[PDB]
Every structure is written in structure tokens, then in C-alpha cells.
Amino acid sequence: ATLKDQLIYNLLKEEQTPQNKITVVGVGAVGMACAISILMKDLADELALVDVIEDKLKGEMMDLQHGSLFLRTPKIVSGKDYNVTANSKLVIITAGARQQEGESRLNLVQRNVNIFKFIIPNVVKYSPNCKLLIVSNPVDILTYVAWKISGFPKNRVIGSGCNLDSARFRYLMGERLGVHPLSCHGWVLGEHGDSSVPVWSGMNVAGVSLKTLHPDLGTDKDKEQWKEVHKQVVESAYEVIKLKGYTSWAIGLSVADLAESIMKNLRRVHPVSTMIKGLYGIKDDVFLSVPCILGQNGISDLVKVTLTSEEEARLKKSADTLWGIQKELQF
Amino acid sequence: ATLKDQLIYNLLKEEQTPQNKITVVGVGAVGMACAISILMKDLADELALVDVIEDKLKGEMMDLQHGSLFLRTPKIVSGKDYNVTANSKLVIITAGARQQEGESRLNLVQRNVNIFKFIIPNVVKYSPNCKLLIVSNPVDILTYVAWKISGFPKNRVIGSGCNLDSARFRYLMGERLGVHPLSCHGWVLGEHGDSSVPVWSGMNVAGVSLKTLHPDLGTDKDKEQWKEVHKQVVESAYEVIKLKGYTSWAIGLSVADLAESIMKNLRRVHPVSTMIKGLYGIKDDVFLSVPCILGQNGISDLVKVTLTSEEEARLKKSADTLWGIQKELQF
Amino acid sequence: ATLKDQLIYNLLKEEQTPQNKITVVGVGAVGMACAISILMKDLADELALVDVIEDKLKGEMMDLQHGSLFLRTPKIVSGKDYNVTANSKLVIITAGARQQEGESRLNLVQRNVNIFKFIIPNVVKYSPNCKLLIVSNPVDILTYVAWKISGFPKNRVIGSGCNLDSARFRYLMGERLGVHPLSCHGWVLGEHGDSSVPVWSGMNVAGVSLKTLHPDLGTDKDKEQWKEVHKQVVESAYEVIKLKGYTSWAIGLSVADLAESIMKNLRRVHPVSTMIKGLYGIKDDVFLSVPCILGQNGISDLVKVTLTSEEEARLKKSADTLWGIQKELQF
Amino acid sequence: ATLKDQLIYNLLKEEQTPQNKITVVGVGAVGMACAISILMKDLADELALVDVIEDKLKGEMMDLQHGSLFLRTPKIVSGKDYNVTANSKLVIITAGARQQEGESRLNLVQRNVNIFKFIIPNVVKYSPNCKLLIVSNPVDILTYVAWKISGFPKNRVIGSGCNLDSARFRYLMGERLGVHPLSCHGWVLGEHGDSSVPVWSGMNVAGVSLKTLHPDLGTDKDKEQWKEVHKQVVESAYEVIKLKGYTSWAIGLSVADLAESIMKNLRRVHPVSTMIKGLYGIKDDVFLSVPCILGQNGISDLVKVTLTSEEEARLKKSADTLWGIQKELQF
């Protein structure tokens, strides 16, 4: 008999479906950062990786596998075929094209639509009941695309949105006040990136409003220019790109955070992108960031933040701009 | 009159030194993977990063900083100057020259030795009481080099040695037996990499020796060819490099495991490179991997493994060739 | 409208079931030790508690609930009705009578049996696919009683057994060697308690056999008295009861460790009680401790430990004794 | 030679003074609940336990030690003599005299003062640079007592204060709103227990003030009775005592959260008791709960909360109530 048969007596052979499975699509810097963070937080009992670059994908899979002794995820798989993704609770999409210098924005978005036209149908076929978490840029447009192609109810399509913007905002705030970001509460909402909206009325430590103490907070004519905090969120994103060429660790950690709430049904509030139609004067099928409650259902609830006229106006403009692009897309 | 003073009443401005600082030298894929693993394992109250490439260095620092909301390390610093590394409890060196001959007449070993020549004095200056953890290759030679330059006692200079080798070996054992690598015990010792030695007599599940069950284990007449498991360890190392260009996650994870033992004073046993002068008929000043007890003093103790004649000859062989290189090193 | 409706817009109201539910039956010192350990290891998305004493049960439930801010388990329920345990994955039974003054061992066993005649049918009623983890003493006998009444396949009926014995043993061995228990490997098998069996041949550090380099290990002729280590394990069990009146923290950690493997499908090897028929010449329906591979299906596999004649004899005697009591049980 | 010496070669025997040591004084339900929460969160490399009841103290030490296999805190000591507390970074005081029938208010505090007259000078004798975290009731007076006897700067004397109060409050809020307590923000300040003050203005989810949405928040006439949430805090405390006789888990978890911020220098904000003279028109040496930034030097900063005149008045009354006792204390 084999060494295995000499050592180990088998009681059963039967193999269940993985109960807590997560899939990462796209093994670039972002996907891999999401991957390691998820593994280190013991969020999955099985992890699947998918990309089109075959060699890189096997390389990444093996690197992770070799670390198994220090992890609590017993099975890591990868492949070009989506059968390896079957029965996923959570599916994270990080796949995207790289914008070229002679390339339009509409052309870039369409290129990622063409990418999602391949990925999404395959994910739905093998994990019909899964939650979708979209990271690919422009996140808000691609969250819409994913929602449209999948045919999933809105609660199952989650966009990364302003989770990272908020994360960075709270870091900067915390460094300014000499207090840990966990205790610095701040919400950046609306469209992810350059057009995001900081809600100055909500910024507080220990529940005392900074806007109440400082009525000119976040305003153009503010002596201290706390507007700088949001300004520097935007600038630092470009700075990181200029310095190392990509961003990984921070986005990886923020995504792991969302995954944690979903996989463990925590029902914590998170600034994520969702179907925004019906509020702040928006009539179009568009996804934007508002604090949402996250659990095993994805987005079960959303918080109705009280926005000023100028803030509401900014979300309108973003939704108009987003729907203006979306109506010119080929499926 | 300022918002911060309005919000927060200061009791004291007192400068203090961090109580559990860790530094990572070399901000490449290995350095960065060690850093993120360490950060997610909550091992340090401060992380410092050092490299010669300045823009990449600042990029990585900021990316890490931006995830502060999801971590318990309140302070991450970086710089070209070693003042940022002061008062470290543990210093991890993952620095190394570009693997490109023709850039200098000095070979890879010689190039990395020169890199160590101005690194080690700089870290011992700011952290005279730290433990040194050497990862850079050739790890065994460089551990000796770091020991020779630093002037540190033996217990405070640790090489990564065969930690990765064993981690990869246990993963593969676990796969053959359908058991988690944590329950699959097995030790690869000697010189890190190609010339490493698997100790067949130690391999066991639940204290049941595999060699006792199966005497042909690791020989040429094994019908299940278990010798192939160590061969695959070597092969997979080259295959990762072939596929993705570098290794990161596995080595990063194993380094964090050592750091855990050290920072928490656990006294766990790890395959790491230490001076083996006085063991296995070795009389020269060489560092090879043996099972070491790891704690707040570094390597406080080492396990004396009984080896077969063949295994002893392979370590001696390694020791001779290592000493042959080192006796011709000028400082 | 309510403030809740003011604050929160609801997307859907789909009520949901726990995906990782754990139930603890018996809310005493052991029961709570398990609960708190489990809660702090983030193993469950819901914890259920049941006991016959209603006032203590509610008060314990509340106390845990009040720690929710610092926990990751969103739901903690309790009740005397077993409808609170519906769809549990793991069911831990810590319930039992205590030996009265006039009471003899036989009378006490049957009284626990009577308790299981109530609990066991009620458990399977609501969670027919759960794993049964038996903690209550006499654990080996009562594991069998769980097995008989449930009608469960042996793989889903698990006795805590020698897990605490091994835990305590490895602690003492560690204290002797100045090594963390994690790196000190030793297995205590067979009947839990006074009649447990230390497997000297499997005791090792870093894969090096203690028996091999110290052949008198295990015998009276030993000058270093290592039999005392196993004897001290027995002594400590009585001593703790004399000193504080009960055991809680050590058993609660051991159980939670078993819980982690089961819930996360780790396939780690643990010393637990399982149907031993057909091993070591034992013909009776008897549960004894051997190393088992624990996963999502409970005990999938057993490690076949090569015992000596002496050890085999001790196990077979335990089996005869256990059946002598089991044969006379009315249930 | 000993088996130990045959197996292990020693590099050095000399041992370092404790680096991350925590002591817990009082080994009742509260002290042990803190002990286990600290251990399971890995906040110390050494834990000391102190009490006057020598038999149960030993029993608890042993029980914790038998769990070392599943813990990452390698050194656990206990003893009646305070030499076992030497070089503690943090000392947690949970020792208290039980409440008697028909017993005077000034009487119970004095009995506890005399307990502190022995404890406090002993702790400073062996850990003169530690931080004191006081848990014993009445927590606000005894924090002051500890401050006066220690001679420590106020920043190093911390009362658990309203930490448990706020934790329970946020659980009840969370239960009402269908959202995890971590996302439900609310502060109860002032005097711990019966006379605590709920700060209705700082109550929010995602920066959205509940007071602003619902101006009746906190008033007797509120149709939704949101004030009952605070009343339910007080009532649950008496209920738990009634149902089980004591309260352990919740207090343990909260205390350990405070320990985390101190040990890892997090600079998070917690509602704890500090010397409040100079604030809110208070003119006496009184300790009251207020948001404080907690780090390696204890309280370095506090948040200046804007209070309504009703809240301010209640705080001033507590101060006067507390000072009346303190000024009539013999120590």
C-alpha cells in the first residue's frame, strides 16, 4: 500500500461545495493586494484567481500557495476558465485596460466595457447567487455596466466608489489633529476620484462637529483651509502614480474591509457606490457613493445623508456627466 | 483660536521612543511583501522603510500610510537617511543589486557585500541593540557578512536561511497527504536554495515518522518517489521567477512569522541560518540553517539534529564551499 | 415615520439565515469559556446558547451582547427552546450533572445519559447536519451516547477527549525544554483522564525524537523522570479543582481550536475522541482518542499511530472498561 | 548530560527585563475577564496576576498556563508579593470589597480605599513608570484615590469610567437601528454608572446627527422614547447582576480595548475618566469621563465636548457629589 494509505485511514471521500469562497478577477497590482489582504484576514475558505495573462496568473497562484503554512485558507486555485470560480460568495473585479496618451476617455471606458462583456457573463454562469464588488475604473460607470450585464438586483452589485477616498481623507485628517484615523470620522461621497464630495457637516471627532466649531470649515474663505484635506486626497493619488507607477496596498486594504462586512454579515456602514436613482434629484440609472450598510446581502440599506444645495448640485452634475457617457456605450 | 486647539486640550507635548519599531531595508517586492505582512499581523508600533531609489521609496510609504484606517500601526516613516530607523527592535534587510552582470566587474556576491558595507554600519549606529534579519542573497554568506561588519553577538544576527525552503516543502507534503501544512512537519536544512538538505527522519504527521512507516523514503528505490518533493521545492522556485519575474508573497509571509516569534518572545523553533561552527565537524565561521529557538534575544538556543552520514556530508560540503568564498572577502 | 426611517432607506427586507452558526449547550464555566474563546476568534456569524437554568442563561447572553462593540459576531441568542439553535454548523455540548455526596460513578453516568436523552434528540431536530462536539464528562462514554441517540455517522460525532491532556502535556514539556508548546510535539491518546496514554515515541522537537536520543524516556529507570510529566498532567487536573473549584480557560481554548479547524475546513490534525472499533484489536462500539483530521465534515480521516504492545494493551483495557459501563446503560 | 542539553545548545542564558508586561490586580470575575481578553488579543509578552486569596490565584494562573499552546503570551506569573509585577508597562486594578446589606455610601468607598492603601504603594515600588488603569468601583473616586497615593502625573492615572457605559449604549442604539455598534456613534460622559450623561448631540451614523433629524432625542416627551436607550443601559447593569450575580465578559472586552490603545500607542479616542478640574466650571480635584486620546503615555489629550447647560449642570452636580466623599476620606 501507499505511504498515504499506511498513515491515514479514510472515513469519507465526499467533498462539499466551498462555503466561504471569494474570487479575484485580474491579478495586477490591485487584484493581488486585495488577494493578500483577504488571505491575511482569514475571510475565505477558498480563493480563486482569474486573468488573461496565463503565465503571470500561475506565478501569482504558486507564490500564494507556497505561503499556506502561514495562512488559514486551505485551497487556492487559478485559471483562464471560470469553472475554478464556481460557488463564490463574493466576486471582486479588478481587470482593466491601460489608458494610452493618444486615447479618449470614451474609448478607454468602452475598452473596459468590452472586457466586462467577457468577464461578467462567465461569473454569473458559475456563481449566479454571488455578490459583485467592482474596483475597475471608472468604478461608478463600470459598476453600472456590471449591474446591466449581470441582470443582478442592485443590492448584489457593489462599487468600490469613495471607500478609498474616505480612507485617505481620514488619514490626512488624523495626521492634522494628531489622532488615529479610526477616531477621525469623515465622509467623501458621490463620484470616485477628482469629482468626489467631502461632507464637511459630518466631519467630527468624538461626535463633536468641526463645522459647528468652525462655521467656515471646508469653505473657500477659511483661514485654516481645511479644504486642503480633500484637495490633498486627490493630489496624493496622482503623486503615488508619479512615484511608483501604481497603487496597491491601500486599495487592497479597503477592499478587504468591505469583503469582511459582506462575508461576515457585519452590517457596518461603508462609503460604496450604489444605485442612486431617486434621490438628490437624480432620475437616471447611475451609481454613486453614499454610506451603505453591508452584509451577506451586499447592500441591504443606505443612509440618507443631509446634503446642502451646493453639495446636491455637485452630485447632479456627476450623475449627468456619468449618464452622458453611459448612453454612448455599445453592449 | 485655531480649530485643533478648540477641539483638543493638550495635557503634555512629551517625545517618546517607539516600543516595538521594525525597519525594512530594500523596498523591492520582497521588502514590500515583508512590510505588508508585518503590518497586517500587528507586530510593530512603527515601521521604517529605507532604499536608495528615492521616488519609489516615497511612493511605497504613502501607499501604506493611506491604509492606516485598516491597520494598527500608527506611524510609518521612510527616507534615504537612517535617522528614520532609530531605536529599532528588529531590522530586516532585503536590499540587493540588480541581477545584471556587466554593470560592474564585481560579481553578484561582491556587489551585495559592498551594499552591506555601508548599510550595516548605518543601522547599527541608530539601532545598536536590534536583531538583524538577513533575507538578501546569498543569504548564508550575507548573514556572515552582516555579522562580521556589525560586531553584534551571534544571537542577534539571523538569516532567513531555509525558512522558505521548509515552508514550500511542507506545502507540498501537505498536498500529497491531504493535510494542512501546519500538521505536516518536515525540515529542510543546510545551505539555502539549490544545495538544501531535506531531513527525512524528521518528517512526520502526529509524531508518526514517515521513514519508519516507509524505509525507502527519500532513497532512489522509492516507488512513490518522495525524493521528488524536495526536487519540486527547487523547481518551483525557478518556475515562479520564470512566470511572474520575482517571488514576494511566500517569502514576505515567512519573514513575518520570524518577526512574530522575535517581537513576541515566543521561543518557537524555526529553520534559520546561524553560525554552525562546532557542529557536524565544522570548524570554520559559517552560517547554515538549523532549527533555532527564536525570541526577544534573537537566536537564544539551537536544536542539535541527528543527521545521517549523507546529510552530514552535504552540510560539510556546503560549509567548505562557503568558507572558500568568505576567506577571500576584503572589508 | 420613525427616526430609523428618517435615517435609513431600505432596499430590501429579505430575512436571512446564519451561514456560520455555533451553538453551545450548557452555560456554565466551561460553556462560557468556549463561547468567549469562539467569539474572540471570529468563528461564527451567530452564537446560540441553551441551558435549563433560565436566569443565568439570560444574564450570560446579555453580558456577551454588551461586548458587541469589540466583537465581530453580529448575533447572540439564547433560550431553553432548541428553535434558537436551528441550522447550527457546530453544536458543543458542555451540559452535565455534578456528582453528589451519596452518589457513585455509575449513578452519575446514567444521570448524564438521561440529560443527553433530552438534549441529543432536540439538537438533531433543528440541526440535522451539524457536527457534535462533546465536552461533558465522562467524555468518551458520552461521545458514544451522543452517537447512539443522534443516529449520526461517526464523522459528525466528536469527543473533545485527549485534546486538553495533550495541551497540558505540551505545556509542561515546553517548561522542561524552554521551548514554546507549539514547537514541543507530544501526543496523549486513548481514554480521557486518569487512564490516558502518552506516546513517548512521537515526542519530538524540530523532528528530532526524544526517545531516540534518550532511550529510557517513558520508563521507571529514567534518571530525569519524564513519566512525571504525564503524571503531573493528571495531578494538575485535580490540583486546579482543589484551588479554584473548576476548570475553564484551558478547556475553552482547546475547544475553540477544534472549532476553528471544523469551521474553516483546515484539515489540521487534533487528538480527539472517535469510534475506535477495528483498531488495536478492539471489537466494541467505543470512542477513544487518536489523531484525527478535522474539517467541514468533522473527522474525515484518522492518523494510524503505530503503538507498542504496552500502549496497545492500555487502549484495549480502556475499551473493555468503557463497554462494561456502556452495556448496562438504559436509554 | 541532561536530555535538554543533548537536544539543545545554548547561546546565552541571560534574560531581559519585561518589555511589554501587563499586570492585573484582583482575580475575580472582572480581573479574569480582562486577563483572557488581553491574552486573546495578544497585547503582552508577559502577564502578572495579583490577589490576596492565594489558592484561587494559583488556580487561575495554572488554568491560563494550560492554554499556552493556543496563546501567544509565553510568560504568565502570579503571586501575593508584588515582585511579580516588576517592570509592568500597564497595571490594571480590579480589586474591590463586596457590597453589603444596609451599608453606608461613605462606608463602602473607605473599605476600598484601605485596599488601595496597600495595593497602590506596592505597584509604584516595582513599576514606578507604569500607567494605572482603575476598574474597581466606585471607579471615579478610586481613580482619584489611586492618583493621590501613587503621586503619578494625572496622564498616567486612567479610570475605566464611562467606557462600559458607552459600549452598552452603542449596542442598544445598534439594535434599534439594525446596524453594527461600530457604526453607531454615541458618547455617555461624566460619572460612571447611575449618574452618567448621554450626549445626545454627538449621536450619529455616518456623520448624520440624530438630534438634528429628531429634536426630541433625549427628552421625556419623545414619542419614540429614545431616552429609554440610556435608561436601558443603567437597567441592564442591575438586571445582569440579578440574573447571574456578577458581570464579566463586557467589562473584560472594554478594558482590553483600552489596553490595546495604550500598549500599541494608537492615539484612539475613548470615553474614560480623567482629572477634570478647570473644565465645565468644575473647581475640584475630580475624575470624570470625557473623550481622551490614549497612547503610550496614557492620556496625552482630551476632546473638548460642547455641552448643553443641562448636561453641564449634571456634570457639576456629580463633581460636587464626588468631592463631598473624597474630602472626607482618610488615607
Ligand SMILES: NC(=O)c1ccc[n+]([C@@H]2O[C@H](COP(=O)([O-])OP(=O)(O)OC[C@H]3O[C@@H](n4cnc5c(N)ncnc54)[C@H](O)[C@@H]3O)[C@@H](O)[C@H]2O)c1
Ligand atoms: N476603484 C478604486 O478606487 C481604484 C483604485 C486603484 C485602482 N483602481 C483600478 O483597478 C484596476 C486595476 O489596476 P492595476 O491592477 O493597477 O492595473 P493592471 O493593468 O496592472 O491590472 C489589470 C489586469 O486586468 C487583467 N485583465 C485584462 N483583461 C482581462 C480580462 N478580460 N479578464 C481578466 N483579467 C483581465 C490584465 O491582465 C491585468 O493583469 C485599474 O482599472 C485601476 O483603475 C481602482
Ligand SMILES: NC(=O)c1ccc[n+]([C@@H]2O[C@H](COP(=O)([O-])OP(=O)(O)OC[C@H]3O[C@@H](n4cnc5c(N)ncnc54)[C@H](O)[C@@H]3O)[C@@H](O)[C@H]2O)c1
Ligand atoms: N531569503 C530568501 O529565501 C529569499 C527569497 C527570495 C528572494 N530573496 C532575496 O531578497 C533580495 C531582494 O529581492 P527583491 O525581489 O525585492 O529584489 P529587488 O532588486 O526588487 O529589490 C532590491 C532593493 O534593494 C534596494 N537597494 C539597493 N541597494 C541598496 C542600498 N545600498 N541600500 C538600500 N537599499 C538598496 C534596491 O533599490 C531595490 O529596491 C534578493 O537578493 C533576493 O535574492 C531571498
Ligand SMILES: NC(=O)c1ccc[n+]([C@@H]2O[C@H](COP(=O)([O-])OP(=O)(O)OC[C@H]3O[C@@H](n4cnc5c(N)ncnc54)[C@H](O)[C@@H]3O)[C@@H](O)[C@H]2O)c1
Ligand atoms: N473533557 C474535558 O477536557 C473537560 C474539561 C473540563 C470539564 N469537562 C466537563 O465539562 C462539564 C461541564 O463543566 P462545568 O464546570 O461547566 O459544569 P457546570 O456545573 O457549570 O454545569 C454545566 C451546565 O450544564 C447545565 N445543564 C444541566 N443540565 C442541562 C440540560 N438538561 N440542558 C442544558 N444545560 C444543562 C447546567 O445548568 C450547568 O450550567 C463537566 O462534566 C466536566 O467534567 C470536560
Ligand SMILES: NC(=O)c1ccc[n+]([C@@H]2O[C@H](COP(=O)([O-])OP(=O)(O)OC[C@H]3O[C@@H](n4cnc5c(N)ncnc54)[C@H](O)[C@@H]3O)[C@@H](O)[C@H]2O)c1
Ligand atoms: N468600572 C466598571 O465599568 C465596572 C464594571 C463591573 C465591575 N466593576 C468593579 O470591578 C470590581 C471587581 O468586581 P468583581 O466581580 O471581580 O468582584 P469580586 O469581589 O469577585 O473580585 C474582587 C477581587 O479583589 C480581590 N482583592 C480584595 N482585596 C484585595 C487586595 N488587598 N489585594 C488584592 N486583591 C484583592 C479579592 O480577592 C477578589 O478576588 C468591583 O468593585 C466592581 O464594582 C467595575
Ligand SMILES: O=C1N[C@](c2ccc(N3CCOCC3)cc2)(c2ccsc2)CC(O)=C1Sc1ccccc1Cl
Ligand atoms: O489611487 C488611485 N490611482 C488611480 C490609478 C491607478 C492605477 C493606474 N495605472 C496606470 C498604469 O498601469 C498601472 C495602473 C493609474 C491610475 C488614479 C490616480 C490618479 S487618477 C487615477 C486610480 C484611482 O482611481 C485612484 S484613487 C483616486 C484617484 C484620483 C483622485 C482621487 C482618488 Cl481617491
Ligand SMILES: O=C1N[C@](c2ccc(N3CCOCC3)cc2)(c2ccsc2)CC(O)=C1Sc1ccccc1Cl
Ligand atoms: O524563491 C526564490 N527566488 C530566488 C530569486 C528571487 C528573486 C530574483 N530576482 C530576479 C528579478 O529581479 C527581482 C529579484 C531572482 C531569484 C531564486 C529562484 C531560483 S534561483 C533564486 C531567490 C531564492 O533564493 C528563492 S527561494 C529558493 C531558490 C532556489 C532554490 C530553492 C529555493 Cl527555496
Ligand SMILES: O=C1N[C@](c2ccc(N3CCOCC3)cc2)(c2ccsc2)CC(O)=C1Sc1ccccc1Cl
Ligand atoms: O480539568 C479537568 N477537570 C475535571 C473536572 C472539571 C469540573 C468539575 N466540576 C465539579 C465542581 O463543579 C464544577 C465542575 C469536576 C472535575 C476533573 C478534574 C480532576 S478529575 C476531573 C474534568 C476533567 O476531565 C478535566 S481534564 C483531566 C482530568 C483528569 C485527568 C487528566 C485531565 Cl487532562
Ligand SMILES: O=C1N[C@](c2ccc(N3CCOCC3)cc2)(c2ccsc2)CC(O)=C1Sc1ccccc1Cl
Ligand atoms: O455592570 C456593572 N455592574 C456593577 C456591579 C458589578 C459587580 C458587582 N458585584 C457585587 C457582588 O459580587 C459580584 C460582583 C456588583 C455590581 C453594577 C450593577 C448595577 S449597579 C453596579 C458595577 C458597575 O459599575 C457596572 S456598570 C453600570 C452600573 C450602573 C449603571 C450603568 C452602568 Cl454602565
